[PDB]
Design a protein around this ligand. Sequence first.
Ligand code: DC7
Length: 330
Amino acid sequence: STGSATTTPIDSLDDAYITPVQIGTPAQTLNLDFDTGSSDLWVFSSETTASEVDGQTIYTPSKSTTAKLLSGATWSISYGDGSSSSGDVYTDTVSVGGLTVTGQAVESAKKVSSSFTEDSTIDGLLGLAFSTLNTVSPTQQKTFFDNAKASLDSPVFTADLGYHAPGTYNFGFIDTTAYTGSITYTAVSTKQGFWEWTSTGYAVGSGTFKSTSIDGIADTGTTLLYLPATVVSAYWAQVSGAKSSSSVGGYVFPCSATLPSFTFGVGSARIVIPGDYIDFGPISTGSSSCFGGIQSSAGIGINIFGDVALKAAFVVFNGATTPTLGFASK
Ligand SMILES: CN(Cc1cccnc1)Cc1nc(C2(O)CCNCC2)cs1
């Protein structure tokens, strides 16, 4: 089998991407945030605290003839931005762009943190990291990709995130018309449950390439590019007037500044992130100070190739017995 679904930025800043997902019988279509950095499929639901719902489409398990309560199972997750959610678990039928998994664990939110509430466009998450990270207790549950994998034509999925444009998540095949040149594959460590890999270095603008190993994760569920303080300092040094702001919580820059591109290495191949991908607009409405799209990972503990980087490439998440990651220019 294969699946293919259009993914859409939630706002003008590409702060996240949503993908329509069908859950239950009859289908309830929710728009989910596909997240290669976590492994829980969780949804706003009829069971979510009323005060914590504001515009989201909700999953109502009582109206799905295929929904079954998973007795005694709970979940609780906290993400890298301080957000969180929790609830109970159903198994139900889930379809993504024509690809169907029966008996998928659908985690129904009882509680959600304020950040989720305030984002009316995201009805929940669909995790695509490794299933060892799933938070369902006392019995861990499998991700959608893990559940679909044996049935797929090929054990892979691809992320094709758009800059200010629609994009695509494919399952089970590689669309060879979606990129230019070749796909360069690189080794993956699953030891932390992530799509974790090692970039071979970076360049700022037209500057010479710096060969240095940068261990990080491919995370569609993170907006920005988080890299070592040294690297980030070298980037923003090339932006006149940029500085690191404690009050704002990162590098900011004059809104009229010209941002240089940022290149990262994949083996001997290079992916180029155009300067304007790194622009996340005024720090507050009407301000002429803008928030930067490349930030230090020093307080995080891990480097994160989030949407800012990934949307500059066609990315293959190869889930063969030994997983690998593929990057191509596009
Ligand atoms: C525009 N960003 C940079 C910024 C920060 C401060 C000022 N100006 C720009 C911040 C944002 N991040 C998000 C999400 O974290 C995206 C995925 N999780 C849900 C919310 C939405 S707005």
